[PDB]
Amino acid sequence: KPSIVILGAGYGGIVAALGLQKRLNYNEADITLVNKNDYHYITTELHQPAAGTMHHDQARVGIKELIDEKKIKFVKDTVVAIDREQQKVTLQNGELHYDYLVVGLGSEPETFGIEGLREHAFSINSINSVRIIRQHIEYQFAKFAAEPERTDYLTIVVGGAEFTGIEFVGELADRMPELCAEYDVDPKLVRIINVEAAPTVLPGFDPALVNYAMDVLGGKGVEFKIGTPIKRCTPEGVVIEVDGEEEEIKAATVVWTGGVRGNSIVEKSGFETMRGRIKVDPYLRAPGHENIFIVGDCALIINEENNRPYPPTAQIAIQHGENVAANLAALIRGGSMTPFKPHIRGTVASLGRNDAIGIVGGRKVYGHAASWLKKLIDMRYLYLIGGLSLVLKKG
Amino acid sequence: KPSIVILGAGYGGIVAALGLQKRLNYNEADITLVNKNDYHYITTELHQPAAGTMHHDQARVGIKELIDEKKIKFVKDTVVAIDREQQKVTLQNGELHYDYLVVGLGSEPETFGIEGLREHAFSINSINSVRIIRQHIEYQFAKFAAEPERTDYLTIVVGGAEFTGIEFVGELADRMPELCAEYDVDPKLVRIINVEAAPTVLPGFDPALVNYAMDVLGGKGVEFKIGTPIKRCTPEGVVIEVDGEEEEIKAATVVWTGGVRGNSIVEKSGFETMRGRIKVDPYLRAPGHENIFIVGDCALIINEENNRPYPPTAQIAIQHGENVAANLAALIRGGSMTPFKPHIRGTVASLGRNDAIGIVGGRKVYGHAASWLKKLIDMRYLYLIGGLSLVLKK
Ligand SMILES: Cc1cc2nc3c(=O)[nH]c(=O)nc-3n(C[C@H](O)[C@H](O)[C@H](O)COP(=O)(O)OP(=O)(O)OC[C@H]3O[C@@H](n4cnc5c(N)ncnc54)[C@H](O)[C@@H]3O)c2cc1C
Ligand SMILES: Cc1cc2nc3c(=O)[nH]c(=O)nc-3n(C[C@H](O)[C@H](O)[C@H](O)COP(=O)(O)OP(=O)(O)OC[C@H]3O[C@@H](n4cnc5c(N)ncnc54)[C@H](O)[C@@H]3O)c2cc1C
């Protein structure tokens, strides 16, 4: 038999595994799915638990429930490195050998060599992380009542005004009243600050949506510093440059949404990467390797319409997964492989549980309609991986 | 005038103010009650929020509801100092003058000058404090899944196996399943440690009850280090001396139930204090001062029947309150006042929602019945201070 190894159980990994599961009958191939955890988590919702608006359990599902144990063998371990030449993968407590390999380890934060960011800041990239963020913030608010001289406890800074950062501050803003009610804090003293290097909030968005969003969040007490870059980060706070002069913000909680790069494991294993990602062939496989397929954030692709790269998104990762499943199933059988054609719909961004901005159907949706739309789109994924039972289990 | 000032709205203080209000007709005297916070909190329940077993809002009640504006005037500020000679009290945002004074600012943690205890440890003495403790523990558990190498995060050390410490570890133990369930932590790796200098846990109680309690908590995964004293404290953990050698415990959370002393203001105000507390006359009044009365944890008293001192407790503080109310009313009226004789009921200690130990009525009650007994006794105070509305609201 031929042995297929899939790394990571993220969007690309899980869609690939489930697809392979559907395509192949028993004994056609040996399939192993490797993930750091026994669960796969819905990354797109991760902002919600981080704020504390939603329980983290909604964002994750157990892998054992998702798959057939006869078809796939599941491994709970951490990837340390990949060796192409030896054709083996090295894990913390194991090693594997693959006839065919699928790589979807997701992304790692991009700090752009900003001083102290990696050490002293938080990121929304996992269940553990959002848990830590949420309880961190709750802890500081708990601490405020003891010494109210220290208003830094109430200050929360988000780095980057890109998609993730804006969703997160929206959730935080919606979260704030209940939190202050819990910890006996005057709502006025709380500061939520969004700091972006770029001159505009939400680049890659129609200005109409952006200003509407700024009206909503600004109405909710959010503060925006734009054209302002983070000079450095310290346990005390952050230091930013305005009008070519240094200014210091003393904040207990600093969260970094500014940028993302591919997993370090990919670059560290001798691949060549632009921004940590690999520019793959029309069949989504690494250049010079017929036996390795790449998906999600680790993969790089460019649009025909403009010589600019497709952004790293859940949706494109899903498409990657289905395509790779099809191609692998065909390839082991000696069949013809299909090239990858990306079909891209529009994305909706939440401004809290009740509010959103989006471009869907080439239309400019706002408010409740946009929010409900986003929820429906997200439900479509749940239907995809787990079906009616999975969707019903949420709500 | 005559002007009466009460400091703090703890058990003694609030019972005192309520007592005066019940006792006196309108316009008879000027009474002002001062507290750092707009609420009075049921200290007796404070261990529960610290574990996270019970929401904190239950443990506190707003003061304004309790008293009648016209009878009493409330000031929300923090006492900074007392000047006996000038007969004045100094606050952060005010100053007050008293014909008669009542002091019940409660207690402050006693660390016995142990290195780093005040800096690096937690105490269960206020709502804010228990909130900080609870969220601290939750924070460590949240941190754990990211790095499971660090088991110190899961370790919680409690100093003292006295009444408070035992209740607290009991609550933590009952708390543990839900807590471990939330943050993806194996229940086994969790350590709860109770550390006492004394050779026995829970001194001053009949040994049978003690053995039963150790059986319960020990069954619940609680660990006891007895005859072992804490040498010093670090943010990483604590250092204790066992078998004539230093031993290092790596624990993220250290909670101190070991000792209590009177409020620092008392020592700082020119009083003469044994353990930061004052030894009062039979009328519950400060020595050398006819216009000053002391209540609660700030007060010190001795039993004739046994040459041992009365401990600082809620119930005795309440008795202080009623006594001071009656005596004060007499003093304003010019009548003869009653000396203070304390009558003591039995005390019950919880081991969680499902278990308790008590010596109420000399029956030495154990288990579930004891728990219900404690709940009823706790309800009695609520009935006293607020009436039907307060008890129903819980
Ligand atoms: C708040 C937030 C909101 C978002 N909303 C949207 C949206 O609305 N629409 C949209 O299209 N996109 C959205 N995205 C982007 C989208 O979520 C990501 O692009 C997508 O998750 C990436 O797909 P992936 O499977 O390759 O990465 P991942 O989902 O991160 O896959 C990583 C998986 O592999 C595991 N893993 C990682 N490293 C290792 C390792 N060394 N060893 C073993 N296992 C490892 C991880 O535990 C995880 O299981 C959002 C992102 C964020 C942070
Ligand atoms: C976990 C715990 C459990 C307990 N369980 C029991 C039990 O089961 N049975 C029993 O009999 N006793 C029990 N006790 C003891 C009892 O709760 C205390 O002894 C009681 O508080 C004594 O009355 P107090 O008014 O002096 O204390 P406090 O209630 O603490 O009075 C202090 C009040 O004054 C305020 N204050 C303090 N300093 C200032 C300042 N400078 N300026 C203005 N305001 C100030 C405080 O905020 C507080 O409101 C327990 C104590 C603890 C910590």
DSSP annotation string for A168-218: HHHHHHHHHHHHHHHHT--GGG-EEEEEESSSSSSTTS-HHHHHHHHHHHH
What amino acid occupies position B46? Answer: L
Measured CA to CA, the distance from residue A49 to residue A129 in angstroms comes to 10
A15, exposed or middle or buried, with CB in 10 Å at 0-12, 13-18, 19+? buried
What amino acid occupies position A334? Answer: G
Q: Searching chain B, which residue's CA lies closest to the CA of residue A130? A: B142
Beta bridge partners of A6: A33, A102
Q: With an 8 Å Cβ cutoff, are B138 and A136 in contact?
A: no
**Helices and strands, counts by H and E, chain B:** 11, 24
Measured CA to CA, the distance from residue A136 to residue A121 in angstroms comes to 11
Measured CA to CA, the distance from residue A175 to residue A178 in angstroms comes to 6
Measured CA to CA, the distance from residue B90 to residue B93 in angstroms comes to 9
Measured CA to CA, the distance from residue B284 to residue B292 in angstroms comes to 9
Count Cβ atoms below 10 Å from residue A111 Cβ, excluding itself: 20
Q: Which of A61, A128, A180 should we substitute to test contact with B (largest number of B Cβ atoms within 10 Å)?
A: A128
Q: With an 8 Å Cβ cutoff, are A142 and B135 in contact?
A: yes
B332 membership: H or E segment, kind and range: helix B314-333
Q: Which two tokens stand for residue A338?
A: 């299909």
Q: Which two tokens stand for residue B120?
A: 């690096």
SS3 label, residue B157: strand
Closest CA to A117 of A246, A319, A255: A255
Residue A58 φ/ψ, nearest 5 degrees? -65, -35
Measured CA to CA, the distance from residue A324 to residue B35 in angstroms comes to 69
Is the previous residue joined to A282 through a cis bond, with omega within 30 degrees of 0? no
SS3 label, residue A3: strand
Residue B145 touches partner A, C-beta closer than 8 Å: yes
Q: Which two tokens stand for residue A103?
A: 């790589």
Method: X-ray
B136 membership: H or E segment, kind and range: helix B127-144
Catalytic residue of the set A162, A167, A171, A322: A167
Question: Do the Cβ atoms of B108 and B296 come closer than 8 Å?
Answer: no
Say if residue A339 carries a ligand binding annotation: no
Q: What are the strands, taking DSSP E only, across B53-119?
A: 60-62, 72-76, 79-83, 88-91, 95-97, 100-103, 107-109
Chain B residues in contact with A184 (beta carbon < 8 A): 128
Q: Searching chain A, which residue's CA lies closest to the CA of residue B143? A: A132
By residue range, what is the domain housing residue A317?
A: 1-395
Q: Which two tokens stand for residue B237?
A: 């953990």
**Binding-site residues of B for NAD(+):** 164, 196, 230, 312, 347-348
Count Cβ atoms below 10 Å from residue A308 Cβ, excluding itself: 9
Measured CA to CA, the distance from residue B19 to residue B295 in angstroms comes to 14
Q: Searching chain A, which residue's CA lies closest to the CA of residue B139? A: A135
The resolution, in angstroms to one decimal, equals 3.2
B216 membership: H or E segment, kind and range: helix B207-219
Count Cβ atoms below 10 Å from residue A343 Cβ, excluding itself: 7
CA A5 to chain centre: 23
B305, exposed or middle or buried, with CB in 10 Å at 0-12, 13-18, 19+? exposed
Radius of gyration of chain B (CA): 22
Q: What are the strands, taking DSSP E only, across A36-87?
A: 39-41, 60-62, 72-76, 79-83
Q: Which long-range contacts (CB under 8 A, 24 or more apart) does B211-219 make?
A: B212/B357, B212/B366, B213/B166, B213/B349, B213/B351, B213/B357, B216/B170, B216/B351, B216/B355, B217/B166, B217/B169, B217/B170, B217/B173, B217/B351
Question: Do the Cβ atoms of B311 and B343 come closer than 8 Å?
Answer: no
Question: Do the Cβ atoms of A318 and A16 come closer than 8 Å?
Answer: no
Q: Which of B144, B178, B184, B253 should we substitute to test contact with A (largest number of A Cβ atoms within 10 Å)?
A: B184
Task: Please list, residue by residue across B205-243, b when 16 or more beta carbons sit within 10 angstroms of its beta carbon and e when fewer do.
Answer: beeebbebbbebbeebebebbeebbbeebbeebbbbeee
Measured CA to CA, the distance from residue A141 to residue A154 in angstroms comes to 6
A185 contacts: CB under 8 Å, gap ≥ 6: A141, A144, A145, A154, A179
CA A10 to chain centre: 10
Count of structural domains, chain A: 1
Measured CA to CA, the distance from residue B170 to residue B391 in angstroms comes to 25
B290, exposed or middle or buried, with CB in 10 Å at 0-12, 13-18, 19+? exposed
Distances (CA, A) of A352 to A54, A168, A169, B29, B336: 11, 8, 8, 55, 67
Chain B residues in contact with A141 (beta carbon < 8 A): 135
Question: Do the Cβ atoms of A233 and A100 come closer than 8 Å?
Answer: no
Tokens 């790269």, residue located? A309
Question: Do the Cβ atoms of A281 and A287 come closer than 8 Å?
Answer: yes
The DSSP line for A232-281 is EE-SS-EEEEETTEEEEE--SEEEE-S-EEE-HHHHHTT---BTTBEE--
Measured CA to CA, the distance from residue B340 to residue B284 in angstroms comes to 6
Count Cβ atoms below 10 Å from residue A207 Cβ, excluding itself: 10
What amino acid occupies position A192? Answer: I
CA B6 to chain centre: 19
B389 membership: H or E segment, kind and range: helix B388-392
Count Cβ atoms below 10 Å from residue A227 Cβ, excluding itself: 12
B35 membership: H or E segment, kind and range: strand B30-35
Measured CA to CA, the distance from residue B363 to residue B368 in angstroms comes to 14
Closest CA to B357 of B164, B214, B365: B365
Q: Is A322 a catalytic residue?
A: no
Distances (CA, A) of B304 to A140, A318, A324, B235: 49, 81, 88, 44
First to last CA, chain B: 40
Task: Please list, residue by residue across A251-271, b when 16 or more beta carbons sit within 10 angstroms of its beta carbon and e when fewer do.
Answer: bbbbbbbbbbbbbebbbebeb
Beta bridge partners of B191: B155
Residue A235 touches partner B, C-beta closer than 8 Å: no
> Which CATH number do you get for residue B8?
3.50.50.100
Q: Which two tokens stand for residue B33?
A: 């009650």
Question: Do the Cβ atoms of A43 and A98 come closer than 8 Å?
Answer: no
Measured CA to CA, the distance from residue A248 to residue A108 in angstroms comes to 27
Q: Where are the alpha helices (DSSP H) in chain A?
A: 11-23, 47-51, 63-66, 117-120, 127-144, 163-183, 207-219, 264-268, 314-332, 367-392
What is the side-by-side strand order in the sheet with B30-35?
B72-76, B30-35, B3-7, B100-103, B292-294
